[PDB]
Every structure is written in C-alpha cells, then in structure tokens.
Amino acid sequence: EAAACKKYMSKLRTIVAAQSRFLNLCLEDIYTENTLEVRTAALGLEELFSDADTVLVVGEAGSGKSTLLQQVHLLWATGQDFQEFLFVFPFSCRQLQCVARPLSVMTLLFEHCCWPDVGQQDVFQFLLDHPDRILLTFDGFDEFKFKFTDHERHCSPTDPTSVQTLLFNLLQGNLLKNARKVLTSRPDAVSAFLRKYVRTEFNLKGFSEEGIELYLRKCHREPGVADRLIHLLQTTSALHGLCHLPVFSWMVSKCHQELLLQDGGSPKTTTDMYLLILQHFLRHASLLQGRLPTLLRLGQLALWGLGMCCYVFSAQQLQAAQVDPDDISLGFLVQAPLEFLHITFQCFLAAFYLVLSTDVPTASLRYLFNCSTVAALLQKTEPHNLQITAAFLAGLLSREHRDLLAACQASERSLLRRRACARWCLARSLHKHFRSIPAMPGFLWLIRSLYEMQEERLAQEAVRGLNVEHLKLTFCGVGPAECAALAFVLRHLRRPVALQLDHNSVGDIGVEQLLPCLGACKALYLRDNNISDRGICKLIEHALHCEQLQKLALFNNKLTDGCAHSVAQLLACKQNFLALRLGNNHITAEGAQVLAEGLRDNSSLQFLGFWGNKVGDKGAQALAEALSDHQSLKWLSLVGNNIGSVGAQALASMLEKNVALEELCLAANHLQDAGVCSLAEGLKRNSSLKVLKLSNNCITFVGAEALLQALASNDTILEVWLRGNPFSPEEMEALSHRDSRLLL
Numbered sequence: 001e002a003a004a005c006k007k008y009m010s011k012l013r014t015i016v017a018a019q020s021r022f023l024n025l026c027l028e029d030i031y032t033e034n035t036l037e038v039r040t041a042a043l044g045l046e047e048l049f050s051d052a053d054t055v056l057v058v059g060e061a062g063s064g065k066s067t068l069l070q071q072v073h074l075l076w077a078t079g080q081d082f083q084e085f086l087f088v089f090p091f092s093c094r095q096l097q098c099v100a101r102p103l104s105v106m107t108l109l110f111e112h113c114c115w116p117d118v119g120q121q122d123v124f125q126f127l128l129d130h131p132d133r134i135l136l137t138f139d140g141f142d143e144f145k146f147k148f149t150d151h152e153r154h155c156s157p158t159d160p161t162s163v164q165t166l167l168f169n170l171l172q173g174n175l176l177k178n179a180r181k182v183l184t185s186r187p188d189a190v191s192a193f194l195r196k197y198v199r200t201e202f203n204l205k206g207f208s209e210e211g212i213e214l215y216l217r218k219c220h221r222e223p224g225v226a227d228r229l230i231h232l233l234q235t236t237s238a239l240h241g242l243c244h245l246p247v248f249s250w251m252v253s254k255c256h257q258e259l260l261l262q263d264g265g266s267p268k269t270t271t272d273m274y275l276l277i278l279q280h281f282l283r284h285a286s287l288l289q290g291r292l293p294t295l296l297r298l299g300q301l302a303l304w305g306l307g308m309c310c311y312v313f314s315a316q317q318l319q320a321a322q323v324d325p326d327d328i329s330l331g332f333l334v335q336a337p338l339e340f341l342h343i344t345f346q347c348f349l350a351a352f353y354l355v356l357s358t359d360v361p362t363a364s365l366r367y368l369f370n371c372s373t374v375a376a377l378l379q380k381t382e383p384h385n386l387q388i389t390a391a392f393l394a395g396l397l398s399r400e401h402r403d404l405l406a407a408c409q410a411s412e413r414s415l416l417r418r419r420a421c422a423r424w425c426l427a428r429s430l431h432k433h434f435r436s437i438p439a440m441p442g443f444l445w446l447i448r449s450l451y452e453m454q455e456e457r458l459a460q461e462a463v464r465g466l467n468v469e470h471l472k473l474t475f476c477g478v479g480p481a482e483c484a485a486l487a488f489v490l491r492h493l494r495r496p497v498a499l500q501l502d503h504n505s506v507g508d509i510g511v512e513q514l515l516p517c518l519g520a521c522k523a524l525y526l527r528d529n530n531i532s533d534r535g536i537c538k539l540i541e542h543a544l545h546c547e548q549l550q551k552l553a554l555f556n557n558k559l560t561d562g563c564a565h566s567v568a569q570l571l572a573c574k575q576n577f578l579a580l581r582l583g584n585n586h587i588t589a590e591g592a593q594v595l596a597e598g599l600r601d602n603s604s605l606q607f608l609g610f611w612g613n614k615v616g617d618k619g620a621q622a623l624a625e626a627l628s629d630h631q632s633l634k635w636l637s638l639v640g641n642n643i644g645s646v647g648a649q650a651l652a653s654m655l656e657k658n659v660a661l662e663e664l665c666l667a668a669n670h671l672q673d674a675g676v677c678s679l680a681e682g683l684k685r686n687s688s689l690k691v692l693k694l695s696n697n698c699i700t701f702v703g704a705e706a707l708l709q710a711l712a713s714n715d716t717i718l719e720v721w722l723r724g725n726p727f728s729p730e731e732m733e734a735l736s737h738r739d740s741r742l743l744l
C-alpha cells in the first residue's frame with residue numbers, strides 16, 4: 001500500500017497527462033515554440049516561473065494561451081518540467097462560471113477537478129499543510145463575471161461561498177498562501193485590481209516566421225509538403241501574415257489540400273480564412289445552402305451564448321436551441337457539456353446568423369459598432385467578442401462574398417439592407433472614435449472591420465475630415481495582419497501621419513503589408529518589432545518614393561551588415577530625410593564602412609543613432625570621415641560601440657572640420673585617456689559642438705585635464721559628461737572646482 005497523498009499524486013498525474021496528451025495527434029510532437037515576453041532576451045516556456053504568487057499570461061484570442069497551459073500540464077504530469085510542484089490543478093473558467101451551487105476549496109479541487117480514491121479528508125489536509133508544492137491554472141479568466149458582491153474576504157477552506165469569491169481570495173493569498181497560480185486571459189479583463197497581486201505578467205504574441213515553418217514541418221510528414229506550404233506562404237504575404245497567430249497556422253495546415261490545389265487564388269482576410277474552414281467542414285457531408293439551417297441553428301446558439309457570456313452548453317440548453325446530433329457532427333461543437341471549437345468560431349457563427357437569419361432586424365446591427373432580444377443580446381455581449389463578431393459581419397458583406405450569400409437568400413433585399421446599415425456604421429466609425437476621447441485597441445478593431453468589408457471607397461470616406469498627426473499604437477498587439485488593415489485605411493490620409501508602432505510583432509511580413517500606406521507617413525517608428533534585413537531592405541526600396549517620409553526608427557531588431565547597402569542608398573538618395581535610428585542591432589565595422597558612403601553624399605540628415613551596435617574603430621573612422629564635411633547632422637550616438645582610441649582620433653579629426661554637429665554621444669566605449677586627448681585637440685578647432693557625452697570610458701584624471709585645458713580656450717561647449725569613469729574620490733572633489741561644465 002501507499003498513503004492517500006502518494007496515491008492522489010499518482011492519480012492526478014495520470015488524469016492530467018491523460019487529458020493534456022491529445023489535441024491520432026500528439027501535443028508533444030505538435031507543440032511549437034510560442035515566444036513569451038514581459039515589461040510593462042525573450043524567455044521560453046520552460047522559464048515560466050523563475051510575495052504575490054500568481055503569474056499571468058495574456059494574449060489575443062487564438063494566440064495559443066489554452067494550448068500553453070495544456071503543455072505546462074503535459075510537461076508536469078510526465079516528469080519533464082515543473083517538477084517542483086507535487087500537485088497541479090487545471091481549471092477552465094468557462095466551466096466554473098456554470099457552477100451556481102456555492103463551494104468550499106475542497107469541493108472545488110475534488111468534485112470539480114480530481115476525486116481522490118481514498119483519504120479525502122487526510123489528503124486535503126496535506127494540501128493545506130504544504131501549499132508551496134501546489135500549482136493551480138485558470139484558463140480564460142476573461143470568461144468569468146466578477147460582481148459587486150464577490151469582493152469580500154474569506155479565508156476558510158471548508159466554508160462554502162460563491163465560485164468567484166474563491167478565486168478573488170485565492171489570488172490575494174488568503175486561500176492556499178504561497179501556492180502558485182497561472183492565469184491566461186485576453187488583454188481586456190486584466191484590470192489593476194487583479195494586477196496588484198501578480199508575480200509577473202507575460203505576453204503571448206504568436207509564432208515567429210520560423211515558428212510557422214517549424215509548426216508546418218511537425219504537422220505534415222508526407223514527403224516535402226511542409227516545403228510546398230512554406231512556398232505558398234512565401235508567395236502570399238497576406239496568408240503568411242495571418243499564420244503568425246497559431247489558430248491560423250492551424251487552419252492553413254488543416255486546409256493544406258485545397259490551398260495547394262488553387263486554382264482560384266488564396267484567401268486574404270480573416271473572414272476568408274473562416275469561410276475556407278467552413279467549406280472544409282462542409283465537405284464532410286451550392287454546398288452551403290445544403291446545410292444552411294444547421295449553421296443558423298448554431299449561429300443562434302452562438303449569438304445567444306455570446307450575449308449571455310456563456311461559452312459552454314448543457315444538453316438541456318442544446319435541445320432548447322434545437323441542435324440535433326446531425327448538426328453537432330458538422331464539428332463546430334466539441335468536447336458531455338459542449339463548447340465551440342474556439343471562441344472565434346462562436347463569433348463567426350454569431351456573425352453568420354446576424355447576416356442571414358430572418359429574425360435579425362436591420363437596426364439591431366447598429367449595436368455591433370456601438371450605434372429585439374437580438375439587440376439586447378448584443379448590448380450584454382462582451383466588447384472583445386463584439387469587436388470580433390463585427391469584423392466578421394463586415395467581411396461576410398464584402399463584395400467578394402455577394403454571391404455566396406445570394407445563394408441562401410430567396411431575396412437579396414435583406415442583404416442589401418444589412419450591407420447598407422453596416423456600411424453606414426463603418427463610415428461614421430472613425431469620427432465617432434476620435435471625437436469621444438476624454439481607446440487604441442478599439443481603434444484597430446475599427447480598422448480591422450473596414451479592412452474586412454474590403455470596399456476601398458469606404459476607407460476613404462471614413463478617414464475624410466479626420467485630423468490625425470500622431471498615431472500611437474505601441475504594445476497594441478500589432479502583427480502582419482493588423483498591418484494589412486492599417487495599410488488599407490491609412491493610405492487614404494492626406495495629412496502625413498507619425499506612425500508609432502514600437503513594441504509589437506510586425507516582423508518582415510508586417511513591413512511588407514504596411515507598404516501601401518508608407519506614402520502617408522512622415523515618420524515610421526518600428527522599435528522592438530523583430531525585423532530582419534529582408535524587411536528593412538524592402539522598406540527602403542519603397543521609402544525612396546515617399547517624399548513625405550523623413551524619420552525611420554528601428555531600434556532593437558535583427559538588422560545586420562546585410563542591410564548596409566540599402567541604408568547607403570537611403571542616405572544618398574532620399575534628400576529630405578531627417579532621422580535614422582538603428583540602435584541595438586548587429587551592425588559591425590563593415591556595415592558601418594558600407595553605409596557611410598551614403599552619408600558622405602547626404603545633405604539633410606539631422607539625427608543618426610547607433611547605440612548598441614559595434615561599429616568599432618574602422619566603422620567609427622568611416623562615419624567620421626563622412627560627417628567631416630556634412631552640413632546638417634546635429635546628433636550622433638555611438639554609445640556602446642566598442643570604439644578604441646583609433647576611432648576617437650578619427651572622430652576628433654572630424655570635429656576640426658564639422659561645423660554643424662551639436663551633440664556627440666560616446667558613453668560605454670573603451671576610449672582611454674589617449675582618445676580623450678585627441679578629442680580635446682579637436683575641441684580646440686571646433687566652435688560648434690555643444691554637448692559631448694563621454695561616460696563609462698576608462699578615463700583617468702590625465703584625460704580630464706586634457707579636456708579642461710581645451711575647455712580653457714573653448715567657450716561654445718555646454719556639457720562634457722564623465723560620470724562612471726575611474727576617478728578617485730579625491731580626484732572628483734578637484735574637478736567640481738575646476739570647471740562647471742564637467743558633468744560628473
């Protein structure tokens with residue numbers, strides 16, 4: 001025999017592993033790296049854990065959050081990772097919302113997760129006694145409803161209470177203090193009330209471009225099929241775009257065979273994708289009117305549930321919405337209480353119902369864009385689900401799908417009327433948005449909706465009269481397909497806009513999908529967006545034809561010497577260009593030498609940044625020589641670029657000639673007193689440079705003096721930064737007294 005603890009441990013592992021294992025398929029063969037990032041390197045799943053003991057994982061519908069927990073569970077239940085926890089308790093929030101009956105923690109862990117065969121009482125005790133060896137996971141937290149009578153304290157494990165009260169208290173640390181928790185949610189339902197008690201907060205972006213490649217390889221084993229899909233994607237920017245989000249990579253893979261036939265051109269918008277998967281399911285049975293009433297019966301349930309904030313259905317609810325076995329087999333319902341294959345499929349079918357059902361009055365649709373029980377359901381529906389439904393609604397009414405839908409109607413009269421109502425709401429939508437700004441996730445969904453409807457004139461109308469100068473979309477979850485929408489709408493602006501896209505997941509594919517609106521930008525900010533030389537070399541060939549575009553910022557991407565020649569062409573040819581930021585990439589001396597040629601033949605540039613790169617002495621020469629004669633550049637960072645005294649000589653020689661450079665940043669090289677001395681020689685023939693940052697540079701009092709001697713005859717400099725250098729406390733005292741401008 002063994003005790004009741006070791007017995008439960010082993011039951012739990014069995015049951016968890018048994019559920020975690022499968023998605024005929026095997027999660028362990030199929031799971032594919034899905035990047036995990038923080039604040040608010042970049043860490044893998046295995047690094048998930050490293051006061052307040054609850055970790056949060058947040059990402060858009062379909063970014064792989066459910067599947068991430070599922071792998072955590074599998075990895076634990078089989079020994080491979082996360083072995084510090086003796087017990088792991090998987091929960092699904094959409095299933096807990098369905099429990100009215102108040103609950104104790106016991107009845108939770110045991111009735112609603114895993115029943116111990118023996119020792120119930122003794123086991124629970126062990127858990128209470130050793131909480132630091134417990135993990136609880138809660139999937140899809142957004143699918144709870146937290147109310148005004150669920151905030152009370154409650155520390156009793158044995159005392160019944162409501163379901164949500166348990167969670168609230170679990171997370172604070174009132175129940176199972178020091179036990180770990182992991183939550184997955186959409187970005188909306190994370191308020192700062194919760195956020196107080198979160199260890200760390202991760203963000204789940206989706207597959208990188210080589211993720212997708214991997215994924216496809218893992219799923220398709222047939223000889224070189226993965227290759228031929230990776231070909232399809234590499235010839236089809238839009239489809240490739242969508243696949244950065246695994247639910248699309250899944251769909252693509254799921255329809256490989258019909259995608260590879262085509263014959264009739266690939267899909268482009270998200271609605272196209274959801275239509276393609278629909279017809280796939282319908283081939284296991286026009287084709288669509290064949291199963292029309294089925295889809296309507298499902299859509300009705302979808303909208304119902306959506307309006308009700310119920311994403312799981314009891315066979316009583318299923319009979320009450322008249323869904324027979326023949327309906328269920330079509331395969332949108334799954335997993336016996338049933339749920340929709342994915343939340344997005346609920347939203348698609350709801351949108352479908354909304355288009356075609358003859359119980360949906362035109363005016364009800366006005367609620368999808370914020371402008372019948374149908375109407376009432378829409379008002380009660382969660383915003384992040386309405387945003388999605390409405391995007392699909394837009395798509396289904398596109399001109400491309402006139403015909404599909406004209407099959408199912410006896411009378412297009414109805415469709416004409418809904419199209420026109422949607423179109424009306426959409427045209428108003430962007431004014432409605434900016435005029436009530438007392439936001440910017442709401443903005444993209446409006447963009448996505450205009451893009452899906454696919455009418456060009458409609459984008460134009462929606463944008464007419466707006467006065468946008470700056471458009472901040474940082475940390476907004478912008479991928480390759482958000483980029484496609486953004487382009488679709490923004491290209492129509494007549495005011496050059498500053499497109500601030502810092503900290504997203506644009507990548508090379510997003511850059512390509514942005515290009516049509518590049519003409520409408522005066523400034524493109526794409527820091528921390530995982531862009532390679534392929535992306536930037538493309539971006540430049542197009543930038544050369546946009547005279548409006550003057551600033552480009554590409555800090556912290558994967559650029560390398562391979563982009564050098566393109567950069568040389570940019571500086572040499574665009575001649576109203578103002579600002580270029582390339583900090584934190586992998587440019588080296590050779591790239592620097594190469595691109596500098598373009599600098600020599602440049603007239604207009606004003607800022608040029610290289611912080612974090614490694615141009616070194618030969619790269620610092622080549623830039624210095626280029627900038628000696630250069631008439632407009634006023635700022636230059638070579639911070640952290642491994643520049644010895646050889647490059648500092650060259651930069652000095654530059655200052656004897658250059659008459660325009662005002663600031664020159666050098667912190668974090670290895671300059672030594674040698675370099676500072678020639679730099680100081682330079683200052684004695686420069687009546688123009690204002691600031692000279694020289695922090696963290698192995699400079700000794702010897703150097704400081706050469707600078708001070710030069711500062712004797714030079715009055716134009718305002719500051720010379722030296723902090724962090726090897727100065728003795730007694731040496732520092734002296735330097736304060738000796739000249740005011742030396743910032744220590």
Ligand SMILES: Nc1ncnc2c1ncn2[C@@H]1O[C@H](COP(=O)(O)OP(=O)(O)O)[C@@H](O)[C@H]1O
Nearest residue numbers: 031032034061062063064065066067246247250
């Ligand atoms: N890391 C992954 N590896 C392989 N497939 C994934 C991964 N993440 C998501 N998927 C695919 O996407 C589908 C839906 O993803 P899901 O985990 O439900 O995202 P979310 O729960 O955030 O909406 C999965 O059933 C699976 O096909």
